[PDB]
Amino acid sequence: LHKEPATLIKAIDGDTIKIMYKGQPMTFRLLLVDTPETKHPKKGVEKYGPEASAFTKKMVENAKKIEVEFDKGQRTDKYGRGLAYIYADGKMVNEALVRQGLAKVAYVYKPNNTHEQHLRKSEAQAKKEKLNIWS
């Protein structure tokens, strides 16, 4: 797995960010994490939804460099969204959200599950600290 440079275009939700990748605007979905949504299909603006959303947004908007890291499996989902680990200044956005109890580790689909263990380790820590979602 390789990190590739990308440019922020706009944060959309806790789990979705629009980025310029290899010169193309693309919507990216954060791999392996589910955050509460402000959009969400059925639901709507669930609890911690606005919180996860502001977290992702501040973190990617205040970064000097954003990098995209594809997993070993398919790289887009059925909506055309990129499936990646997103890094802000060397820090993985997907892990940061899980470490703060602002996301749960998702339904996992091999072979896109390389950082599954790391994330689960951060999820257990946030639960144990009883943070946000976990309180």
From Swiss-Prot:
Residues 115-135 are annotated as: Disordered. Ca(2+) binds at residues 15, 34-35. The active site is at residues 29, 37, 81. This is Nuclease A. Residues 115-131 have a biased composition (Basic and acidic residues). The lineage of its organism: Bacteria, Bacillati, Bacillota, Bacilli, Bacillales. It comes from Staphylococcus aureus. Coiled coil: none annotated. It is found in: Secreted.
